[PDB]
Every structure is written in C-alpha cells, then in structure tokens.
Symmetry: D2
C-alpha cells in the first residue's frame, strides 16, 4: 500500500489510538472529494487506505481528527484537526508515510517517502 498514516501522542508517549483520519483528493473544480478514511490501530497506524492503481498523481489532503482524540482524553485542545496537504508525484519514491506527532496546542507532521 502506497499511503500509510502514523499518529503519536506526545503527552502520553504512545501511539494515538482510534484517531479518525479522512483522506480527500482535489477535484477539477477545486473541491475536496472523499477518497479514503479509517481509524488508527492500537499501533497508531492506518494501513490499507488505498492501492497503487487508485493513488494517482494529484493533490491530496489527510485530515486527522485531533480534537476528538483530545476530548476523549479530557484534555482541551487548540486545533480542530491536523490537515496535511501534498501532491503525490510519480517520479519520486513510491511509498508515502504521513506521520503526525500530537500535543494539545501543537502538532508536527512529517512525510517519509521511500522506494
């Protein structure tokens, strides 16, 4: 699978489990079309979102529902969600891992693109 999402919790030092993730693909009219979604596993990962066939070049958005995660932990968060927007390119490495590190008032996101 060409796209994986990994989410970590910087407050507990653990995978961020059961975090909803929604992936969208930018349509010709500039709107965001639902593409794939899921919830992170006990390892904070979400595999099997798409296939090589369907994951064509284009602009994608990965929305991580961080607010609901923090609310479940009873911690007041800042962001509505974490959004990661990027262009999928065929010339570069073919496996994309979108990693996110979550804190209540901060998040970082990193792309690990490999062959």
């Amino acid at each position: 699978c060409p796209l994986m999402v990994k989410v970590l919790d910087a407050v507990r030092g653990s995978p961020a489990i059961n975090v909803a993730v929604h992936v969208f693909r930018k349509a010709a009219d500039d709107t965001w079309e639902p593409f794939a979604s899921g919830k992170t596993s006990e390892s904070g990962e979400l595999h099997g979102l798409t296939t090589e066939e369907e994951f064509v070049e284009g602009i994608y958005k990965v929305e991580i529902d961080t607010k609901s995660y923090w609310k479940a932990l009873g911690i007041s968060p800042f962001h509505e969600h974490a959004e990661v927007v990027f262009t999928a390119n065929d010339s570069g490495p073919r496996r994309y891992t979108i990693a996110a590190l979550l804190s209540p008032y901060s998040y970082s996101t990193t792309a690990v693109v490999t062959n």
Copy 2:
C-alpha cells in the same frame, strides 16, 4: 494584535521571510470566507491581520504558503501549505500567536494563547 503569525526556517536557522499567509473564517453556510492575508516580515512575523472588533468567535483557518517559500530557495518540498484550523474567542477574546517551524518534508505548528 489578537492574531499574529510567526514562521521559522529549520534549514537555515532563521525567520522565514516573505511567506504568504491567508486567513479564512467559516461562514454560516459552512464555507471558508476570506478573512485576512499578508506576508511575513524580515523577522518572520506577520502582524496587523485583524482587530479585536473584527476577530469574532468562529472557526478560523490560517494557510501558510510554504511550498512557494521552499521553491524560491531551490527546494521542492512535500507540502502544498501548512494549514492551521482552530476555534477562536469562544470563551471571550484571546490573543493568538500561531507559530510554524518549516522543513522541506515536515512542519510543526504551535499556538500560544494569552488573555488580554
């Protein structure tokens, strides 16, 4: 300055200068409406986006155009932009500093929220 944006470049160890920033507010019909925009200064800061009066309760999106920034430095980065989406002023007026730390394949954003 109820809203300030600060952007740093983690490759150069400097402020990220001349970075375009667009702010939107969610309208009643759930669409994003343009709210304010500007560019970071030599200090990597953007002040004067709004006023206390105009910065009412709402869901705001701060779009930082990071791709253009990296491309002008000769780097083809991963992200199109860094988007920061948050509810503001729902418990009264606050001062928000949205900070972003940029690398070609990673970014981190932090909010510093203080009471007037």
Copy 3:
C-alpha cells in the same frame, strides 16, 4: 543579548514559565564548565545570560530543566532535561535564540541565528 532562550509549553499553549536553564562551555581539558544560568520569565524567555565579550568561540551546552517543570504541573515526563549542544561564534559573533517546545514525552529545539 548574544544568547536568548525561549521555552513554550505545548500542552497549555503558553510560555513555559520559571524553567531553569544552565549553560556550560567546553573547557580546554574537554570538561563542561559552568557558563551561565537563569530561569525563564512570564514570557517564557531568558535574557541576560551573557555578554558579547564573554560569549567567545566554543562548544556550548544549554540544559533546560524540563523534568522539574512538568512535575510541578502534575506530569511525570519522559526526559530529564532538554540539552542543546552547539558550536558558537566560530565565524565571528552571532546572536543565538535557542527555542524549545515542550511536551511530556517529546520536545523540539530550534536555533535562530542572526548577525549583529
């Protein structure tokens, strides 16, 4: 202010106040020698650690006592401290801002280096 330290709390979205900071310089015998120390203010900043004259070329270590900070807030964090080790002024005098973003099980540190 050739050297400034700024510390933010990513759980509260605020400056990290009253954080102890110890600066060391590597001596000729390769040991760490105390250089300066202080605590962050209400703004999360620590100024006045040194002067242009005293801040000579060398390898410096900025120790930020993050564990004590978290424990006073009721959190048992992972790290003992955040250590920032760097060569300074080897190409002439520079102004260094060492920024740290703290979470209980993670921290990020950035350096902003400018010419006088």
Copy 4:
C-alpha cells in the same frame, strides 16, 4: 529488545541512514559510561542495542551524531549532536522507542513507550 532508536531526515523526507548513535548509562559518580552504540540502518532504525537483562532502571543518554550526518550531505548544521536523557522505569511500559526528527537547525525527539 527494550530500546530502539529511529531517526528521520526532515529535509529529504527519508530515514536518516548511517547515523551514529551512542548510548550511555549514568554511573554512581555522575559520569556517563558507554553502554551501547551502532549506526542506523537503511530504515533509519537501530535495533538490538541492549537486552532486557542489561537494561535496568537508571538514567540513560542517547547521543545521535547529527553533525556528521549533515556534513555528509553537505548541509551546515547547528547542533553538535542530539542528546536524549531519560530515566528507564520498570513500572511503566516495557519497550522504549526514541525517535528523532532532524533538520539542520532544529530537531525534535519523541519517546514512544509501549507494553
């Protein structure tokens, strides 16, 4: 293995390969005693540093030689290295993953402690 180190490169969006890592254990006299070391793999990981038997409670330091990594890439770095200092505790989760995200003038480190 109870201790793993994972290093990523935020400039290239890749694992940070062949990064030297040195682990030290704080001795009774407050000095740092060499404990384990290695170089990250092609996946940016370093496994097999120690064993459950030897990784007793105590204060450890993980030093990641980031300066040499950046120099090999021809990029001027700020830090001499990234140091991660922590206390190993038996009551909590028993597997420690020390992750580091590297940029020339910035790094972040995260501990993922699991059971």
